[PDB]
């Protein structure tokens, strides 16, 4: 009811989907129907693919610096529209407006800006072989890539995916999460408004098992970039391979550990833990959900942790004093509660939370209290499985080598962090943790220069950093022979 | 048979597989049984994995310069044993002895030598963020990788895969093709003799559908490197994704084009055409099986090709005077012969060859004469599909933009080549070809410095060159915060 | 004087110089006094050096993306004032308004734009040594750099020198040529309006023997970048080295060769030659002043050269129809005419020009007719020495290996060019030429990505390209030891 | 003397110097004349340069892997003859035999081993411009470069200079120190024996004042690498530049600071201090001659240092237990004795040594006892200036930022080191120290992977690391124009 019927975006104009069916998107703070959104058919994906192939031809035909200037124009618009877009992100995801105004559009435009200035620097190699022959390589675009986004950081994930694709000369077909489609459509307007060729950034909406699947199966799409669940990511990746042998980037979940060593400043460690567990209402791909505290500091540490949680300002995501909103949708809230119920059932001593917040207007919303369990064993479900909700698990260890072994005893490897004041230990311990994103005495910072990605089953490939731009290009090796040819026939 | 029963290689020695199964490997030139080879069981795969996990711990713990010395010592051994192994490769694949003595072991040891000197150079980045924080990356080994090799260049493929894998600090479990398992076991002997830690290169032999599959499903293996056909490569990758989300390198087949431009010296163009079609008896993934001649030179070019083909010395691969051996096996010959029937049947003009050679002692072997088809259209099966046998398809074009457009009208993209004398055309045309390996006035050369891999459905990832060594490491980003930690809680 | 009396630029403002002396800058088109320019004192050098140290500390303190934005605003400002700044560049140099509106500020700002997006890309190395120790490198700013500019491309040289200097986090003290000081002062205004901290770009004006000398001898300045004559550059470098061991970059002169091979299209060969000899009225270091034509084509080539010269529109640099201005000054004119007189004296067959244009209103200016000599020997003065004027020398060669040999036979190595239609010849020939900037079938184009500098006595170090930005930082190696320290004492 | 007349090594042979003069080299341990050494005349430098011109052409004409193998065999020869050369190094330098078998030849072949394996990794860039034009760079040898070595590490310095020089494809003319010429001549044999082309590594011996000067002035030499004192390095750099505008690498002196922070293990801080002052009898450019100890720890630290100094087993370098030899010559000894006598005069509280050892057989040698001064102010001569001897200066500081400010306050900047167990302190402190080699909780280890060189007046350029290999090539930029040429005339 709140917004006009959202249509598909193909070729710089809005288009009509050829399906006749729609789905709704819902405000989690109250339950509003935000908009009826059209779902794409197999015919609409085929249209976006054809629109992207021809649009990419124009984008790639430009100079490195033209694309650089156009993308930089898109940065300028994103900054001028920060407040407008940040509010729209809060309507759809339920994230505090204090967070979306400073983080989502801010750091999403940050990465677009970083690559925008690196486009002219994309280069190939040159190797001499002998007086008569040398090889040189080219870095050409892949062509049409497609990105599938998650719902916790809709606008940023779109930028973190599309920024390097466009910097490298590709067109991207973006499918926003079925939960949060509004914001990605506004980014398509902005890319077109900045001068990006028609077709280079199309947006397809609809159910994940259908339109997302069809994008991954398509014979002309050259790469799939996916953010989401590890379990879903496997089904996605196997499909992208078996269909046409596409290159893939996977940013999946993780049960990331945070080790607090004895010489750590406990006040800093408690600030770290709560930031790593309860920011965005605990709905971050890289949250440090397994906090390893040394037995000797266990009691003092929970004292500091409960003190922070109790002053967490939960409330309406539209209110500026709110730093803790609802969960993304009523279905997801229920599973987070199921895990919370599972932690109680296996006798993991609750400390706070464990309730759905219902008093006053919070019954109209999908509110879950900041929840911390303690005295957890390694075999409990809340220690083994990714909850993707505001649930901190405090584990107790005895030796340094035990905490590193346990941090590693997970099928996940997205993030890890140590907190310590010793030079030797900080570096020695971070080297032993099997994770791609490692923090020392901090948590949650991802600058655009720093490649971020998962070990093991938390991901394949990387995002951000220099390395990521390279993986949106293909190496072509050209050997130039200047001398005579030796045939054995 | 000709050799003792080849056992499994795990932990620095030969071991007995516990499976109870064996298989024969056959010389295609005469039909003699070369050896009985043991097949790995699921327990043996587990044993090799446990050996690699442990052996990799030792290897990564050495200093980069010690590993470099160890790999270089193996190079000296490979040069010491060139003629021995080349002979072994000729019994196992049937390739002429003039080829295996100069190509298979030489260029395999060429690549190992290259990476042997690059180990001390593997480095990570360091990025300043602010006076109070910096990030640095580590290039950690993936751990235990697995390689699955093809049968056309057994020892060469094993070397191109194990060299960067071992140079990066990994342990690799190698599965040679069930067709040609002998040479890879000698490679395990050589690495151990040079000082490689026990377990860093184990070799399991056996079926692709069982032991090869069990490897790609294994949870403790971190990457799969595969060489073979595209239809098989899709299933292999889908298995590695769906199982544990492994990293992959795919070296698949292709129907690579060779465009001969009107200004080409047709004598060089004809030597290039045959070298790209009949070396290794047409069993090279990167063979340029679609030859583009301009109509004005078609007649004279066919003359030049036909004159050269008639000289080809088909005969016993044990004779050093033979330059054209049998195919790898009789089943494969039936398939290559099946395609020839399609070219005769689809009204394509057979120019020479086109039959199986049975004259004299050649009936005991899998011999197909070099076959040239001409007046081929794009709708014919022999133009659209990888034959992997000595079959040349000569296509006629009228202008440049047709020939480049047609060369690209394929789902394959492994190699391509132009033959021309004009500076502007050579560079302009080769830029427009959709292939990862481009040759100008030459063919089939892959220097170790030059990354090689396929576009489109011809591959994922690269081999050789600096970039490949990078893709046997994973990036870990460590952000060190030295200043204060902020918190919204 | 046309303009108000020009002061020094130190600390974000114009200040009064403590010398008591001034000098005039003169319009070469008519003889008009453009401005009185202040001469810098020793106290003024000491004053600007203290300001650059204070400014660099502020500048290095910003985040890389802050520096990137500031520089990008200066790029946008420079695009807005292109025609205005181009007008000022034409009064000061006498170069046509058709050139300065197209080349001078355009390609100077191009380099600033290139480097502006690369600041977040400056990174250091990280090398693990063993589990117990690792090394990382930093790319720290050099500190306070100093630039001494030439007068042929006043505003462009300032940008090409200051763009990498500031992008790397350094402060620069720039001394423009005493002949062309006007534009350097406007750029200091532009950097300040764009947000550059006070002191990061100061401007000192005056004679090289005084102010330029004091800058190269000052102990707190860490690097000197000088563009100018080879004879002068040697004294500058010896002075900067002997004084405090500053690192240096030299862009010096050249007698650059242009080899036309027999199979070249002479129409392009003649178009290249005139552009390489008469652009900017012949006053470019990278001019092709030795043109090698094959004996067979000499007659045809001179004809094509004469035909092109005869349509050169010499005239008032303020006329847009003018594409060939006067020389930069009357003293320099006597020099260019002295060389012409020496070549007439040495029996070179003057083909056209060779005298000063004095007809009508051209008498007020230092106009020299485009001069081409032919039938030249290698020992003549016009062939051996750098003229820096509109004088083309046509030498006749007989085969390829001789022309490469003669072209290399010089103490210079700045630029060289071949013109040919053959793939093999172009690359083989350009590989044997001892010059740092090599063009094939073109001339005089310098993209920002391409490192440009001289071999031999034509220069030290490079400008533009990635490599230059690296050489405006100094490497610091930090080894962190995490284990025990062993001592033999 | 003990050995026959040592001659010049030019063009693969020992040759007769055309000078008629000779000079002697003396064992500092006893005073025996080791050899009569010939001085090169001006005519011999021309012979060695012309030999190097021809020798390099053969060397650069080889493939990267051929050159790599030749250098790699030379490493092997050096490894076998390590203990032989270590014996020769002790006669000439007087350095303990416990040092020369472990450090001098080991770490010299270490760097040669590093670069020998990096030759195929030398690559250039390729940058596209438009469909019709691209730029590529080549990294070509400089040609004939020349090295001047210091006398403290004769074999090590010769290797660290020639290893990257040859790996890049250059020929070197090396002039050993007039003090220590012996080992440099045996290195020339070893290169030739490994297969180095004749002339690629020549050795001229003789006066610091004459032959070294004649090399830096020679017009066909393209680079000078000098290791030695800053006073001479300034004259060296000035002369090589003013003559023919050569590039230089300078490894000059330093008064390197060692900051011991309050939270440090004093025992490790003392092990570092003595090693950083007394290895090689204190004659290393990177010696930590300014030790900064905090006021509170001064007493305990002085004790731990003196406890260690008192057990230094000084003695005859031909002994296996001698770990402290004489100084390199009787002239150098008196200079070191001179600095001590002045430090006594400036009222610095001597702690130990302070005298020349003459008791018993040590009177025949140039033995100087390990000397430590304490309670030092910055005014003193022993604190500002390069002693190059076993003289440790202990400065007392009060708070952290002051010690950083004082340690930085020198015209030198080769090395610096902090000893602390705090993450933030260690890294923040090392970031503000202005030296090219920074050590944390260690000292004096210099791997081949880590570029080493000085800030400020301690050097120009780097040695070791990849970057050093890069700076023995010159970049040539090649722009290929495939489209039309646009001429404005
Ligand atoms: Rb929603
Ligand atoms: Rb993975
Ligand atoms: Rb076989
Ligand atoms: Rb692919
Ligand atoms: Rb002027
Ligand atoms: Rb030079
Ligand atoms: Rb000596
Ligand atoms: Rb310096």
Short mmCIF file of C-alpha atoms in Angstrom, two decimals, chain A residues 85-391:
data_model
loop_
_atom_site.label_atom_id
_atom_site.label_comp_id
_atom_site.label_asym_id
_atom_site.label_seq_id
_atom_site.Cartn_x
_atom_site.Cartn_y
_atom_site.Cartn_z
CA UNK A 85 18.25 6.00 0.26
CA UNK A 86 19.19 5.30 3.89
CA UNK A 87 15.58 5.82 4.97
CA UNK A 88 14.35 3.51 2.20
CA UNK A 89 16.80 0.85 3.41
CA UNK A 90 15.34 1.20 6.92
CA UNK A 91 11.76 0.74 5.72
CA UNK A 92 12.71 -2.52 4.02
CA UNK A 93 15.27 -4.20 6.31
CA UNK A 94 14.25 -2.87 9.71
CA UNK A 95 17.79 -1.74 10.37
CA UNK A 96 18.18 1.32 12.62
CA UNK A 97 18.25 4.56 10.65
CA UNK A 98 21.31 5.47 12.75
CA UNK A 99 23.09 2.55 11.04
CA UNK A 100 21.80 2.82 7.46
CA UNK A 101 22.51 6.57 7.30
CA UNK A 102 26.23 6.11 8.18
CA UNK A 103 27.04 2.58 6.95
CA UNK A 104 24.96 1.15 4.10
CA UNK A 105 25.04 3.85 1.48
CA UNK A 106 28.27 5.30 2.87
CA UNK A 107 30.44 2.18 2.58
CA UNK A 108 28.61 1.01 -0.53
CA UNK A 109 29.59 4.16 -2.36
CA UNK A 110 33.05 3.84 -0.76
CA UNK A 111 33.88 0.74 -2.81
CA UNK A 112 32.43 2.17 -6.03
CA UNK A 113 34.75 5.16 -5.53
CA UNK A 114 37.82 3.00 -4.83
CA UNK A 115 37.49 1.00 -8.05
CA UNK A 116 36.38 4.04 -10.03
CA UNK A 117 39.89 5.38 -9.66
CA UNK A 118 41.53 2.00 -10.41
CA UNK A 119 39.94 1.34 -13.79
CA UNK A 120 42.82 2.93 -15.79
CA UNK A 121 45.25 0.81 -13.78
CA UNK A 122 43.89 -2.58 -15.00
CA UNK A 123 46.88 -3.97 -16.88
CA UNK A 124 48.40 -7.07 -18.43
CA UNK A 125 51.86 -8.62 -18.43
CA UNK A 126 54.63 -8.68 -21.01
CA UNK A 127 57.32 -11.37 -21.14
CA UNK A 128 60.12 -11.61 -23.73
CA UNK A 129 61.02 -15.14 -24.78
CA UNK A 130 63.89 -14.81 -27.30
CA UNK A 131 65.02 -12.26 -29.85
CA UNK A 132 62.26 -13.51 -32.16
CA UNK A 133 59.29 -14.08 -29.88
CA UNK A 134 57.43 -12.55 -26.91
CA UNK A 135 54.08 -12.99 -25.16
CA UNK A 136 51.81 -10.28 -23.74
CA UNK A 137 48.55 -10.73 -21.87
CA UNK A 138 45.32 -8.76 -22.04
CA UNK A 139 42.70 -8.34 -19.34
CA UNK A 140 39.33 -8.38 -21.14
CA UNK A 141 35.92 -8.25 -19.49
CA UNK A 142 34.10 -11.50 -18.79
CA UNK A 143 31.02 -10.05 -20.51
CA UNK A 144 27.66 -10.31 -18.73
CA UNK A 145 27.95 -11.27 -15.11
CA UNK A 146 25.02 -11.72 -12.76
CA UNK A 147 24.90 -11.00 -9.03
CA UNK A 148 22.52 -12.49 -6.46
CA UNK A 149 22.21 -10.42 -3.31
CA UNK A 150 21.31 -11.00 0.31
CA UNK A 151 18.90 -8.92 2.40
CA UNK A 152 20.98 -7.67 5.37
CA UNK A 153 22.93 -5.04 3.34
CA UNK A 154 20.87 -4.72 0.13
CA UNK A 155 22.30 -1.44 -1.18
CA UNK A 156 25.91 -2.15 -0.14
CA UNK A 157 25.97 -5.74 -1.46
CA UNK A 158 24.73 -4.42 -4.79
CA UNK A 159 27.57 -1.87 -4.83
CA UNK A 160 30.21 -4.28 -3.56
CA UNK A 161 29.22 -6.62 -6.38
CA UNK A 162 28.53 -4.20 -9.22
CA UNK A 163 31.34 -1.72 -8.53
CA UNK A 164 34.17 -4.03 -9.70
CA UNK A 165 32.07 -5.65 -12.43
CA UNK A 166 31.43 -2.30 -14.05
CA UNK A 167 34.94 -1.05 -13.38
CA UNK A 168 36.23 -4.05 -15.38
CA UNK A 169 33.86 -3.42 -18.30
CA UNK A 170 31.09 -5.95 -17.64
CA UNK A 171 27.35 -5.64 -17.49
CA UNK A 172 25.68 -7.07 -14.38
CA UNK A 173 22.17 -8.52 -13.97
CA UNK A 174 21.34 -8.06 -10.30
CA UNK A 175 18.63 -10.03 -8.51
CA UNK A 176 17.96 -8.44 -5.11
CA UNK A 177 16.88 -10.64 -2.25
CA UNK A 178 13.19 -11.61 -2.48
CA UNK A 179 12.91 -10.03 0.97
CA UNK A 180 14.34 -6.56 0.16
CA UNK A 181 13.93 -5.55 -3.51
CA UNK A 182 13.20 -1.82 -3.21
CA UNK A 183 16.66 -0.35 -2.72
CA UNK A 184 18.39 -2.16 -5.61
CA UNK A 185 15.88 -0.63 -8.04
CA UNK A 186 16.86 2.89 -6.89
CA UNK A 187 20.50 2.09 -7.59
CA UNK A 188 19.62 1.17 -11.17
CA UNK A 189 18.10 4.64 -11.66
CA UNK A 190 21.27 6.20 -10.26
CA UNK A 191 23.61 4.23 -12.54
CA UNK A 192 21.52 5.30 -15.54
CA UNK A 193 21.31 8.87 -14.24
CA UNK A 194 25.14 8.95 -13.98
CA UNK A 195 25.55 7.95 -17.63
CA UNK A 196 26.00 4.16 -17.50
CA UNK A 197 24.91 2.73 -20.88
CA UNK A 198 21.41 1.32 -21.19
CA UNK A 199 21.52 -2.37 -20.30
CA UNK A 200 24.74 -2.41 -18.28
CA UNK A 201 22.90 -2.73 -14.94
CA UNK A 202 19.53 -4.47 -15.14
CA UNK A 203 17.45 -5.53 -12.13
CA UNK A 204 15.29 -8.68 -12.03
CA UNK A 205 12.93 -9.38 -9.14
CA UNK A 206 11.09 -12.43 -7.93
CA UNK A 207 11.36 -15.70 -6.00
CA UNK A 208 14.87 -17.08 -5.44
CA UNK A 209 14.19 -20.64 -6.55
CA UNK A 210 12.97 -19.44 -9.98
CA UNK A 211 14.52 -16.20 -11.29
CA UNK A 212 17.79 -16.59 -9.38
CA UNK A 213 18.03 -20.19 -10.59
CA UNK A 214 17.40 -19.18 -14.22
CA UNK A 215 20.13 -16.55 -14.07
CA UNK A 216 22.60 -19.16 -12.82
CA UNK A 217 21.58 -21.59 -15.59
CA UNK A 218 21.78 -19.17 -18.49
CA UNK A 219 24.30 -19.99 -21.28
CA UNK A 220 25.43 -16.34 -21.97
CA UNK A 221 26.10 -15.31 -18.35
CA UNK A 222 29.81 -15.66 -17.57
CA UNK A 223 30.02 -15.33 -13.78
CA UNK A 224 27.73 -15.48 -10.76
CA UNK A 225 28.41 -13.50 -7.60
CA UNK A 226 26.35 -14.72 -4.65
CA UNK A 227 25.90 -13.53 -1.05
CA UNK A 228 23.80 -15.76 1.19
CA UNK A 229 23.66 -18.97 3.17
CA UNK A 230 26.38 -21.59 2.97
CA UNK A 231 23.83 -24.36 2.43
CA UNK A 232 22.11 -22.41 -0.34
CA UNK A 233 25.46 -21.34 -1.79
CA UNK A 234 26.45 -24.92 -2.58
CA UNK A 235 23.25 -25.56 -4.56
CA UNK A 236 23.84 -22.26 -6.37
CA UNK A 237 27.47 -23.02 -7.19
CA UNK A 238 26.87 -26.60 -8.42
CA UNK A 239 24.17 -25.25 -10.74
CA UNK A 240 26.42 -22.53 -12.16
CA UNK A 241 29.10 -25.11 -12.94
CA UNK A 242 26.98 -27.88 -14.44
CA UNK A 243 24.92 -25.52 -16.59
CA UNK A 244 27.67 -23.72 -18.55
CA UNK A 245 30.88 -23.79 -16.40
CA UNK A 246 30.65 -20.25 -15.02
CA UNK A 247 33.23 -18.58 -12.81
CA UNK A 248 31.89 -17.89 -9.30
CA UNK A 249 32.31 -15.70 -6.23
CA UNK A 250 30.67 -16.90 -3.00
CA UNK A 251 30.28 -14.85 0.19
CA UNK A 252 28.44 -17.18 2.54
CA UNK A 253 27.76 -17.39 6.25
CA UNK A 254 30.08 -18.14 9.12
CA UNK A 255 30.30 -19.04 12.79
CA UNK A 256 33.19 -16.66 13.30
CA UNK A 257 35.18 -16.90 16.59
CA UNK A 258 36.51 -14.13 18.83
CA UNK A 259 39.31 -15.18 21.25
CA UNK A 260 39.83 -12.92 24.28
CA UNK A 261 43.30 -13.57 25.68
CA UNK A 262 44.10 -12.98 29.37
CA UNK A 263 46.11 -9.79 28.82
CA UNK A 264 43.23 -8.22 26.89
CA UNK A 265 41.61 -5.03 28.16
CA UNK A 266 38.22 -6.46 29.18
CA UNK A 267 36.40 -3.14 28.64
CA UNK A 268 37.61 -3.07 25.01
CA UNK A 269 36.82 -6.78 24.59
CA UNK A 270 33.25 -6.25 25.78
CA UNK A 271 32.74 -3.35 23.38
CA UNK A 272 34.12 -5.57 20.61
CA UNK A 273 31.87 -8.53 21.44
CA UNK A 274 28.63 -6.56 21.46
CA UNK A 275 29.53 -4.81 18.20
CA UNK A 276 30.35 -8.24 16.71
CA UNK A 277 27.08 -9.85 17.86
CA UNK A 278 24.31 -7.26 17.98
CA UNK A 279 25.03 -4.70 15.27
CA UNK A 280 22.21 -4.66 12.70
CA UNK A 281 20.23 -6.69 15.27
CA UNK A 282 22.86 -9.42 14.97
CA UNK A 283 22.21 -10.00 11.23
CA UNK A 284 25.71 -9.73 9.76
CA UNK A 285 27.40 -12.35 7.56
CA UNK A 286 30.66 -11.91 9.52
CA UNK A 287 29.44 -11.85 13.15
CA UNK A 288 31.66 -13.18 15.92
CA UNK A 289 29.04 -15.50 17.39
CA UNK A 290 31.49 -17.73 19.34
CA UNK A 291 33.25 -15.69 22.04
CA UNK A 292 36.07 -17.59 23.70
CA UNK A 293 36.77 -16.16 27.16
CA UNK A 294 39.46 -17.46 29.47
CA UNK A 295 38.09 -19.13 32.60
CA UNK A 296 39.86 -16.63 34.88
CA UNK A 297 38.12 -13.66 33.25
CA UNK A 298 34.80 -15.39 32.58
CA UNK A 299 32.88 -13.83 35.47
CA UNK A 300 34.25 -10.30 35.04
CA UNK A 301 33.64 -10.45 31.28
CA UNK A 302 29.95 -11.35 31.45
CA UNK A 303 29.59 -8.51 33.94
CA UNK A 304 30.93 -6.11 31.31
CA UNK A 305 28.85 -7.76 28.53
CA UNK A 306 25.50 -7.60 30.35
CA UNK A 307 26.23 -3.98 31.22
CA UNK A 308 26.49 -3.11 27.51
CA UNK A 309 23.45 -5.15 26.40
CA UNK A 310 21.17 -3.53 28.98
CA UNK A 311 21.85 -0.05 27.53
CA UNK A 312 21.20 -1.24 23.97
CA UNK A 313 18.54 1.16 22.69
CA UNK A 314 15.93 -1.05 20.98
CA UNK A 315 12.97 0.69 19.35
CA UNK A 316 11.42 1.91 16.13
CA UNK A 317 13.99 1.81 13.31
CA UNK A 318 12.63 5.21 12.23
CA UNK A 319 13.60 6.78 15.61
CA UNK A 320 17.10 8.31 15.70
CA UNK A 321 17.87 7.00 19.19
CA UNK A 322 17.30 3.40 18.11
CA UNK A 323 20.45 1.35 17.62
CA UNK A 324 18.70 -2.07 17.59
CA UNK A 325 15.86 -2.75 15.16
CA UNK A 326 13.71 -5.78 14.38
CA UNK A 327 14.80 -8.79 12.35
CA UNK A 328 14.36 -8.70 8.59
CA UNK A 329 10.99 -10.46 8.34
CA UNK A 330 8.57 -12.37 10.50
CA UNK A 331 9.62 -15.81 9.13
CA UNK A 332 13.30 -15.21 9.90
CA UNK A 333 12.46 -13.94 13.38
CA UNK A 334 10.73 -17.26 14.12
CA UNK A 335 13.75 -19.41 13.18
CA UNK A 336 16.08 -17.19 15.26
CA UNK A 337 13.69 -17.86 18.14
CA UNK A 338 13.75 -21.59 17.36
CA UNK A 339 17.51 -21.53 17.81
CA UNK A 340 17.09 -19.50 20.99
CA UNK A 341 14.64 -22.16 22.17
CA UNK A 342 17.20 -24.78 21.13
CA UNK A 343 19.88 -23.15 23.29
CA UNK A 344 17.59 -23.28 26.33
CA UNK A 345 16.73 -26.93 25.61
CA UNK A 346 20.36 -28.10 25.70
CA UNK A 347 20.91 -26.25 29.01
CA UNK A 348 23.16 -23.37 27.92
CA UNK A 349 22.77 -20.86 30.81
CA UNK A 350 20.90 -17.86 29.35
CA UNK A 351 21.98 -14.45 30.66
CA UNK A 352 19.67 -12.01 28.85
CA UNK A 353 17.24 -12.03 25.95
CA UNK A 354 15.58 -15.28 24.93
CA UNK A 355 12.23 -13.49 24.50
CA UNK A 356 10.40 -11.95 21.60
CA UNK A 357 9.82 -8.29 22.46
CA UNK A 358 6.06 -7.73 22.45
CA UNK A 359 5.15 -5.00 24.96
CA UNK A 360 3.60 -1.89 23.44
CA UNK A 361 3.93 -1.41 19.71
CA UNK A 362 6.75 -4.01 19.54
CA UNK A 363 4.10 -6.69 19.04
CA UNK A 364 3.44 -5.30 15.57
CA UNK A 365 7.16 -5.82 14.83
CA UNK A 366 9.62 -8.70 14.50
CA UNK A 367 11.63 -7.79 17.59
CA UNK A 368 14.03 -10.22 19.30
CA UNK A 369 15.84 -9.18 22.45
CA UNK A 370 19.64 -9.04 22.41
CA UNK A 371 20.31 -12.59 23.58
CA UNK A 372 23.46 -13.96 25.23
CA UNK A 373 23.94 -17.58 26.27
CA UNK A 374 26.92 -18.71 28.31
CA UNK A 375 28.51 -21.95 29.52
CA UNK A 376 28.07 -23.45 26.05
CA UNK A 377 29.70 -26.71 24.95
CA UNK A 378 31.20 -27.32 21.50
CA UNK A 379 28.40 -29.74 20.47
CA UNK A 380 25.36 -27.50 21.17
CA UNK A 381 23.43 -26.35 18.10
CA UNK A 382 23.93 -22.66 18.90
CA UNK A 383 27.70 -23.22 18.81
CA UNK A 384 27.72 -25.41 15.70
CA UNK A 385 25.15 -23.63 13.51
CA UNK A 386 24.84 -20.11 12.13
CA UNK A 387 21.82 -18.48 13.75
CA UNK A 388 22.05 -15.16 11.87
CA UNK A 389 20.35 -13.55 14.83
CA UNK A 390 21.27 -11.59 17.91
CA UNK A 391 22.69 -14.53 19.90
#
